[PDB]
Design a binder for this molecule. Structure first.
Ligand SMILES: COc1cc2c(c(OC)c1OC)-c1ccc(O)c(=O)cc1[C@@H](NC(C)=O)CC2
Ligand code: NA
Ligand code: NA
Length: 124
């Protein structure tokens, strides 16, 4: 059975809009979302559908771009690093569950390279 998705909105948290947070939604997330290899990462891993009965035994901090999109939208992150950490968690989850050179891993690696290039261009 799948777990509920990660939390995406917390109204009790203070909210701010920042250059970097806008860039993360409007440029970084938008570009990754449209990538050839985006689709596996656009929603939580559905371990039941994908037939990975052990997935949530091994991955205890699931993350995905749908979740990240929501978090940005709901001003869930105070600091840009929180967002960057979520992307890093998503890529690493893939590397952790799978094995070096797996097709899915290569796809994640490609997405990550684009992500890193975009991060290098994050505004001050
Ligand atoms: C976002 O993470 C994952 C997303 C997916 C898969 C997966 O496990 C290999 C993941 O975890 C690393 C996946 C799973 C099971 C399959 O049977 C399959 O054919 C295919 C896949 C994936 N496609 C591949 C491996 O080529 C697509 C969905
Ligand atoms: Na398969
Ligand atoms: Na590519």
């Amino acid at each position: 059975m799948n777990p509920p998705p990660p939390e995406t909105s917390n109204p009790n948290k203070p909210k701010r809009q920042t250059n970097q947070l806008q860039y993360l939604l409007r440029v970084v997330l938008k570009t990754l979302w449209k990538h050839q290899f985006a689709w596996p990462f656009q929603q939580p891993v559905d371990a039941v559908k994908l037939n990975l009965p052990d997935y949530y035994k091994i991955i205890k901090t699931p993350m995905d771009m749908g979740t990240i999109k929501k978090r940005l939208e709901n001003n869930y992150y105070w600091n840009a690093q929180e967002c960057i950490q979520d992307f890093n968690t998503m890529f690493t989850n893939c590397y952790i569950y799978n094995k070096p050179g797996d097709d899915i891993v290569l796809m994640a690696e490609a997405l990550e390279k684009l992500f890193l290039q975009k991060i290098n261009e994050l505004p001050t």
